[PDB]
Symmetry: D2
Subunit: 374 residues, 4 copies
Amino acid sequence: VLQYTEISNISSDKINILGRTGKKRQPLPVFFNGGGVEVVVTGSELWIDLETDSDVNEMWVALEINGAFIARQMLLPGEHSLCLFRSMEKTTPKRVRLYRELQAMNDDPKVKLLFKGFKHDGEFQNVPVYSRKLEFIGDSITSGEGSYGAFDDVDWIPMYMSASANYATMTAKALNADYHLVSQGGWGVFCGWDNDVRHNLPSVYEKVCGLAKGEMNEELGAQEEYDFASWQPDAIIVNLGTNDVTSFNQPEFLNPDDGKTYKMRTNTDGTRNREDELKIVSAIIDFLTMLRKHNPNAQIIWSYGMLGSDLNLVITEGINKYKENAGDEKVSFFQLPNTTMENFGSHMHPGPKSHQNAAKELVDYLRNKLGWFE
Amino acid sequence: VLQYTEISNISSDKINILGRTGKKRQPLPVFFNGGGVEVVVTGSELWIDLETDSDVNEMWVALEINGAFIARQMLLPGEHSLCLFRSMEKTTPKRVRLYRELQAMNDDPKVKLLFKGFKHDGEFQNVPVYSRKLEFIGDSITSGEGSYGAFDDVDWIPMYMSASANYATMTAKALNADYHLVSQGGWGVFCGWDNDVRHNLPSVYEKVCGLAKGEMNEELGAQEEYDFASWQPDAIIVNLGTNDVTSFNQPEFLNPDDGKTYKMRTNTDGTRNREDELKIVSAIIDFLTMLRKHNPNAQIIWSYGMLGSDLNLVITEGINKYKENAGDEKVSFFQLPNTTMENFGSHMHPGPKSHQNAAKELVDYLRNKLGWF
Amino acid sequence: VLQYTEISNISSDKINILGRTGKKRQPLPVFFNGGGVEVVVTGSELWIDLETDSDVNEMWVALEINGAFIARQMLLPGEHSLCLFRSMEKTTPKRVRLYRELQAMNDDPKVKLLFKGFKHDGEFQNVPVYSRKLEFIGDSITSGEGSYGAFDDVDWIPMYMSASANYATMTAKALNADYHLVSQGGWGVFCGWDNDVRHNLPSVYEKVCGLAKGEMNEELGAQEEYDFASWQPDAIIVNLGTNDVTSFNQPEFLNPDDGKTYKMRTNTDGTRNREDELKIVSAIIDFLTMLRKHNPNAQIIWSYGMLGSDLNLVITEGINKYKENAGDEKVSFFQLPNTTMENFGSHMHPGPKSHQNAAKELVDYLRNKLGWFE
Amino acid sequence: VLQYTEISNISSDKINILGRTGKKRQPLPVFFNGGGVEVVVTGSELWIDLETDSDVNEMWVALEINGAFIARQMLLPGEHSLCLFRSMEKTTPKRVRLYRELQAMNDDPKVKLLFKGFKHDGEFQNVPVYSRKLEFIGDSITSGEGSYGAFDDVDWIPMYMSASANYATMTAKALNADYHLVSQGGWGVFCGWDNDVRHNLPSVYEKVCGLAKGEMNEELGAQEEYDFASWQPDAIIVNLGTNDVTSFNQPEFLNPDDGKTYKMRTNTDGTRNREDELKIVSAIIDFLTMLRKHNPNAQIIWSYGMLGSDLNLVITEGINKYKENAGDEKVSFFQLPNTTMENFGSHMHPGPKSHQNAAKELVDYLRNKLGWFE
């Protein structure tokens, strides 16, 4: 006989909730990629009860036991009782981490992941205490898009995305740190790759999950303001700009809302338009002020370069102008290594090896920057 | 809507069946680790209908689309409808490979995996043709035991075993080769690590799946003689001996079947008992004979060393004596690189990196030996 | 027997002179690290006749045959006849490159290396034509200080310096490019590591070899203005800043020239003084102007990071302010990877593996920037 | 002021002599590749006085200070005074290792290296004590032939050979071990690559340096019986067989010393002549006996495979028959990794990387076999 324990009935000491949470606690909505739970349990068997819904973009999850990747799978709409381990030695504790592989989906109001409770024959023990906290904000790189799948695959579908093979989770793991991911493929600091001015991360940063819209998501608490005071990160890693630079080489965008045409322009010369560059610069300044406002003590580190480094000067202009004007001494720039021909995954995006290389250089930087040498 | 096509109703040029098959075609019994199917299909959606049974040791499978690892999961007893992909661009063909992660289980008559058919909106295309064929015979290394899981995990359960992170499948993939895996954790060429003389790979080699025993498996055709003529490998990789050397440092074993006790002995000198070494030599001679008989043209390559190389001399003594007596010029010894501290997986067994290292050296050996440049 | 040919008598197409040269042609003065000659010769034997002088800091050279490192040795004062190869097959050509390992020595008027001629039994053939040209401006990293020697060796001596194991020559080689190295251990863009304001690279850039001073050096043509027009690089790699950062944590410097004390200062909270930061910013602006002036078409790439990246924002402020004012769309910033624990050489400076890692990242960057995919 | 000290006048506790010695101690003959001396000295400078002779094949040496490669150079006939270091901090002890890069030359009676003494302003300190000892017996792989030079270079001359980049010295260094190298390029256990039955390592093993022949070498004591009792290795690594395999595909050899023609035969179906295979087996048994006789306690390890493993079965047949008849439980076979496409040096032989890979695998084997985890 397995006991059933509702997720909200577990002592805060005996569960780590990974990722941003709002007001709803039973069942637990897991809004973000990398989001989920970690428990440490004895016993022979563990199952998690969950509910999922979706249409075009189905849910994916991944499981790690004692820090090691074990499983990865799709979940189709409905109730599931998912077996996390079985036939194990009863007396020894196992650390179990199950998390969402798929990013929040801005244009998809149906997709959701809800954790209800656990079935178990053993007992819950105290979970590791993560004093170190890292927030990651980004585009599809931070969504781990291309981290699975063959070189030539191009379909924009969930199976190619992950938190399981991802520089951010690799960095958090190496540094023994709790982590939040906030990301959206194709989105920029100012506009999306396709010149879509609505597709910027800043506009969506402040709600519990601003990227989860519609009635159903509203019932889950996603559109309420996020309680920043409850989770203050030591550092905020900002990996944005790739899509902003891409937009300069992309056709003009007609906006369905405010019926105007937007285009980040390139000079006849081949260089970027300056006032257009300045729109990014200002967007950067505004975003940095937003971040400082909600995280008064965090080290903000703009970390950019896994898919080219052409926005180097524009990014650092934004930071420098913000810094001098605000007297902010805890804002840095760190360039990530570029993905070489050999290390691409699918969608011509960074694969596992590029993520690993990026995590290695980011971890080294954070050790020195934060004094996290141990 | 979704068409249903039974696995046996896909014409040969539009399916690759991976692994030893017997007389049963519908549904398809998936006997061995690394066994399964590969198809290439258009359409937006593909499902596979399958049945599984198990008790203590539940079934695991892994999915690869266009050669890339996508998913890996447990399957509990019953009929399942597994979605292999969905929401895809309809016109592009996708190569889909779905295989078993769990070895055949000698002492577990209930465990099984059956493939019934596909649900699909697209059409089956010609699959790639693998004229190059490789058979791998081994112990838990070849079962990929330890290829998943943390350093200190020790439970002997399915989640830790794989074909997905495995030197054998990495080797086959690199060389663009069809492969068969025949393996059993803890088993030797002569005896198991615990001195169990019944636990030797030669004794199960000749059947479709000799490691699939009991009534249900018999009905699946596992206990009939394997038709070797239908699938002849270019090379046979034999990775045995690790468990034979281990037995020398392990307590005696009481055989439940004859009441006799068995113990591979070491002298109060620290050295292996010479008479016992010779039982391994004889098992090797006998197994090479068996292998030649069923595979008259294959290059036999004893590949050993991922968990120590202590048996190098006994193995080559076996090979050398067999070869001289048989006049066999197509038998070799290749040493695999040892697993070092930075490269252990779980169970103190080879991890992904060790498998990778071993595959690189083996691939290079096979290119040169077989002219596979 | 062995013919003798003065370096001056070898036709321009039969010799590649590496490094800046002035008016003196016979004998040929080799002013800079990485400086020297490349020839392609048949015959069984080749010797070079040379002259060297020194006292505290003896000369070192290294030999490459067909692009492969062969030899490295010190040369003490006097005339030398150095055997480059012997007992070889007579009919086969070999490419021979002999170059200086030691940087120009600013405060050492005696140290010199002069190439006089070759003793040879075979014939000189046409040497490769390098249309690609790269200038590298740097501190001890670009001097390869630490590229030889054990982890704990600390003596500030020539044997530890090289162009033979050096990210710059590695980059040049990978790219099939002619190269000039101009560097001084301990120097910055504004001041030296010890707060010494006369120890900046801009101040020595414009002469043939501003770092070769005194009478005998003046006779060698070193203090004459360099003819920039005669050697125009496709890209200029600037690796400076490490010593400017260090000066902030270093005791004040008394300048023996003008008797003033100089000190880059740190605020109570540990951050750098803004005004002192601005002095580095200005020096950067001024140097970029100097570079653009003498090199109207070169891509200037500030490449910094092998020993810490804390000057990222200051460097990027300098570049951005310079750029916004001039027309210049041909200045970039590129961050080099940091030297980790297991990749230090001697003097706690980057070792062979660190140079190698840096060269790999820089090469990838240069390919994509300059269109040198082959 | 420079004191002069003869090599034979340094206390045994203040010098490590590397390589086989005979009864000639002053001056010290350096017979073998990897042979030479190690001292540790204070002071600002150190010179070594040495004599060398040669004709076609000139002497090469390499210098390591505190375990780090510093220098490599040719030495032409005559007396030399080599400066090993200078201008150093007087009080710090420096460990200095100077060794021969060139193998003993069987058919070159003129080539020689002698160490006479040191000029030094500091004092000799105690040297490290290497209680662990390793003997390496091999062919050109063990002579490090190909370890320097470009991929397509083919001339059989000294500059391409080394102990400085060599699996044997890499192994010894890793295990903190004294080492002796005994090697001859082209030579086998039974015959040379060209079917020359005189070119076998067993025949020269027992003398101080059996490969140093002729009157001059006789006066150096090379042709006297080696005193094995004075230096007993923990392990003997035998890397032979590559040339024995090769001979099967090479034209017959006309032996000068008798009138006879020798040829290892290949059957008209492509396989090796069994009777000729058995000649190698007998040579192996015979050599193993010889090794056991002079080394009663050593672990003998046949380590083969850096240039193919085709003789795997014949070698282990030799070992197996030897061990059975002798009851010898301290003889092993370890197959070394094959040199792959990316890892060749010059002459289609193993380059630095292949040596390194071989050393790492061999080091791991010896740690386990000899219990050298410390």
